[PDB]
Amino acid sequence: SGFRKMAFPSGKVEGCMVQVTCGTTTLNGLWLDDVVYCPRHVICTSEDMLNPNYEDLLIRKSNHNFLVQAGNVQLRVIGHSMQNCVLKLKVDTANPKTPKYKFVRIQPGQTFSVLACYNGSPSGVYQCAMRPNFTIKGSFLNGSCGSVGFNIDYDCVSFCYMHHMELPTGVHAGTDLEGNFYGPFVDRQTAQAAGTDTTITVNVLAWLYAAVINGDRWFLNRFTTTLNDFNLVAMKYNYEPLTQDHVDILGPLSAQTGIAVLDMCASLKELLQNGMNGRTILGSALLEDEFTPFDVVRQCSGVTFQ
Amino acid sequence: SGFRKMAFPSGKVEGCMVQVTCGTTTLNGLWLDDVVYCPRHVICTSEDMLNPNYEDLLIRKSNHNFLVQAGNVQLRVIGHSMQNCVLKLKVDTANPKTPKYKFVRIQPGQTFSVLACYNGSPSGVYQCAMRPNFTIKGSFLNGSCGSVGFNIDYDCVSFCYMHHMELPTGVHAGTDLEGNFYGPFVDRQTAQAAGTDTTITVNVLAWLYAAVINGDRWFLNRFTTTLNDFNLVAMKYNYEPLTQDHVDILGPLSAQTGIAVLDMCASLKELLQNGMNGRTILGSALLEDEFTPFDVVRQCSGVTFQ
Numbered sequence: 016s017g018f019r020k021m022a023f024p025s026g027k028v029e030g031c032m033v034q035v036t037c038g039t040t041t042l043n044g045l046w047l048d049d050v051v052y053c054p055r056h057v058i059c060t061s062e063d064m065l066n067p068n069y070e071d072l073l074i075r076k077s078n079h080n081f082l083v084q085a086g087n088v089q090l091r092v093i094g095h096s097m098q099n100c101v102l103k104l105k106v107d108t109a110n111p112k113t114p115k116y117k118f119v120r121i122q123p124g125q126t127f128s129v130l131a132c133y134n135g136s137p138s139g140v141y142q143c144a145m146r147p148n149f150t151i152k153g154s155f156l157n158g159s160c161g162s163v164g165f166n167i168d169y170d171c172v173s174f175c176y177m178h179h180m181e182l183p184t185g186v187h188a189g190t191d192l193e194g195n196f197y198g199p200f201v202d203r204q205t206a207q208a209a210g211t212d213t214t215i216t217v218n219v220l221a222w223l224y225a226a227v228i229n230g231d232r233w234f235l236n237r238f239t240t241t242l243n244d245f246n247l248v249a250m251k252y253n254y255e256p257l258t259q260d261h262v263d264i265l266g267p268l269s270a271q272t273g274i275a276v277l278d279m280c281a282s283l284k285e286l287l288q289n290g291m292n293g294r295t296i297l298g299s300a301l302l303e304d305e306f307t308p309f310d311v312v313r314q315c316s317g318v319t320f321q
Numbered sequence: 322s323g324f325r326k327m328a329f330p331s332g333k334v335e336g337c338m339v340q341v342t343c344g345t346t347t348l349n350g351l352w353l354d355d356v357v358y359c360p361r362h363v364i365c366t367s368e369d370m371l372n373p374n375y376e377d378l379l380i381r382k383s384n385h386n387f388l389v390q391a392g393n394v395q396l397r398v399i400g401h402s403m404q405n406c407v408l409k410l411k412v413d414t415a416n417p418k419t420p421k422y423k424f425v426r427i428q429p430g431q432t433f434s435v436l437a438c439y440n441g442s443p444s445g446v447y448q449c450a451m452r453p454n455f456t457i458k459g460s461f462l463n464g465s466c467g468s469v470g471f472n473i474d475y476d477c478v479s480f481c482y483m484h485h486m487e488l489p490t491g492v493h494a495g496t497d498l499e500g501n502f503y504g505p506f507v508d509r510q511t512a513q514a515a516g517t518d519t520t521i522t523v524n525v526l527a528w529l530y531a532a533v534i535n536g537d538r539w540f541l542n543r544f545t546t547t548l549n550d551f552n553l554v555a556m557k558y559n560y561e562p563l564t565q566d567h568v569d570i571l572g573p574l575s576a577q578t579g580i581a582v583l584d585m586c587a588s589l590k591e592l593l594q595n596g597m598n599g600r601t602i603l604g605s606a607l608l609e610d611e612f613t614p615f616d617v618v619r620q621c622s623g624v625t626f627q
């Protein structure tokens with residue numbers, strides 16, 4: 016019993032965090048094998064923030080401009096290359112702590128654990144979702160750039176996020192580990208705003224299944240709904256459209272609880288139209304949308320990682 | 322910016338989790354130096370659950386009854402001793418991954434990270450508080466016993482919780498690492514209930530400071546309040562009494578935000594009496610009480626761990 020925003024165990028990633036200093040900029044890098052990945056705006060200065068030509072900026076760099084600290088051991092950069100918005104610093108030492116890992120570009124709606132770091136030292140771990148507007152509602156201060164988001168699958172760390180910047184609304188934007196921003200954002204200080212976000216409907220439904228698995232039933236009802244009539248209601252309340260693929264993905268949870276997906280949709284419909292009327296679901300007074308169907312099954316069933 | 326329920330990085334603890342099997346019972350143990358700590362009800366069977374004499378049960382055990390798996394390496398038990406409700410299995414191998422660590426018995430209201438584990442394999446990490454009624458609102462399934470809760474201070478893991486049991490309300494009860502239950506609970510299957518819980522007032526106030534640090538101000542007001550008149554209101558809404566010591570602890574947050582503690586109390590008073598009126602604080606529609614003042618300062622300022 017119980018349901019918590021659960022992050023993956025972070026140790027496999029902690030072992031990869033390093034400090035990258037270039038000029039007056041310090042941020043975090045991800046040390047996998049003999050490469051340190053970090054946001055390319057590490058090669059920018061206080062005047063370089065605005066409209067930088069990173070190819071120009073980078074050819075003016077030498078390897079010894081890049082100060083990579085792995086704890087209390089200075090790593091020597093022997094080469095560098097820029098891939099989209101990530102800098103790849105080739106170092107002379109392979110990280111002996113390199114986990115089995117993949118780089119994955121996730122879809123919006125997908126969740127991940129963020130290992131927040133400063134000066135290459137992990138500070139905290141929390142679960143985020145990639146919002147539909149490709150921002151993440153993170154917790155990031157100055158120096159957190161290069162902190163990564165990740166999922167773990169048995170023994171394999173799937174890195175999916177590297178932190179680059181905070182938008183004026185206080186949400187966060189970054190890239191996959193191959194340096195491609197999530198969303199329309201660019202790594203240059205110009206007018207950029209998040210764009211209107213929407214609620215991740217399939218995740219809300221998953222969490223409603225989590226609630227039923229855990230003994231909250233007060234929100235269930237007799238009614239059912241069609242996928243279209245649900246989506247017409249979702250529509251109004253700024254909810255992401257629910258697709259048939261979403262429905263299928265919610266299959267196991269529907270099968271475990273005996274609640275047809277569209278029945279749960281009928282329940283969410285009435286939740287959207289009636290509020291919760293002073294009640295809570297899984298300790299929340301809001302409809303929670305940062306658990307995927309996978310998240311619910313993993314935590315309500317006990318999947319682990321070796 | 323941003324504010325998240327942040328757990329500590331779990332790697333230092335992941336390196337200590339092991340599987341302890343005795344008879345038909347498998348649970349987790351905590352391997353520090355050459356000792357494996359685990360709940361003593363590992364020596365119980367399906368009929369032994371009810372009113373066991375653990376001293377009786379334990380003298381009937383031999384060391385080879387204890388099967389300790391550290392990943393894929395069998396640890397040999399060379400001795401065992403029971404300390405309150407924890408079993409200490411002496412093994413012939415010191416954990417090379419043993420962090421700097423302390424055992425600490427925390428006060429209610431204090432938070433910690435739980436590294437949820439099954440079969441000695443970490444499954445997830447989340448932040449909990451010790452509730453005023455000495456339960457924790459955890460996320461725990463069969464086999465999670467022996468999962469530990471912890472805080473990290475620079476390099477030192479302060480273990481404060483070991484998981485033992487779920488109560489009928491779905492909340493969780495366990496011990497400190499010296500085997501002393503938090504609360505009135507005992508490790509034997511009898512009528513035990515959590516006892517009425519209360520909201521951790523000083524933590525709610527801390528989180529209100531977190532909100533102001535992060536730019537939510539809608540709940541602040543002109544008014545102030547006396548500590549007594551606040552506590553008379555807290556009283557009604559099942560809030561833990563706020564002490565002067567609590568006030569002092571909220572000092573730095575008051576100093577950082579320029580909001581006197583009792584002014585923030587006046588704000589919480591009106592939140593308790595007016596609800597939030599369809600508004601949210603730090604993405605919550607409830608008053609959140611599982612951030613300590615320390616938690617807020619750490620995350621709003623960036624404290625890390627080497």
Ligand SMILES: *[C@H](O)[C@H](C[C@@H]1CCNC1=O)NC(=O)[C@H](CC1CCCCC1)NC(=O)[C@@H](NC(=O)OCC1CC1)[C@@H](C)OC(C)(C)C
Nearest residue numbers: 056155156157158159160179180181182183202203205207
């Ligand atoms: C890296 O450690 C740091 C992390 C952020 C600081 C505060 N919280 C964070 O997540 N990232 C930055 O400081 C970047 C700097 C680079 C400069 C080169 C271009 C990419 C960003 N900047 C920010 O995140 C600022 N955001 C910003 O400038 O946005 C302007 C519009 C382009 C989006 C932050 C620090 O400024 C504000 C807090 C938004 C005022």
Ligand SMILES: *[C@H](O)[C@H](C[C@@H]1CCNC1=O)NC(=O)[C@H](CC1CCCCC1)NC(=O)[C@@H](NC(=O)OCC1CC1)[C@@H](C)OC(C)(C)C
Nearest residue numbers: 362461462463464465466485486487488489508509511513
């Ligand atoms: C250990 O892995 C396991 C973890 C719990 C299982 C479900 N969630 C958990 O946190 N712990 C147990 O199964 C203990 C077994 C020992 C037996 C010897 C005495 C101490 C507990 N039991 C429970 O947590 C049960 N709770 C219980 O029996 O409470 C009865 C009153 C004494 C409190 C759970 C499994 O049963 C219910 C879910 C409450 C029905």
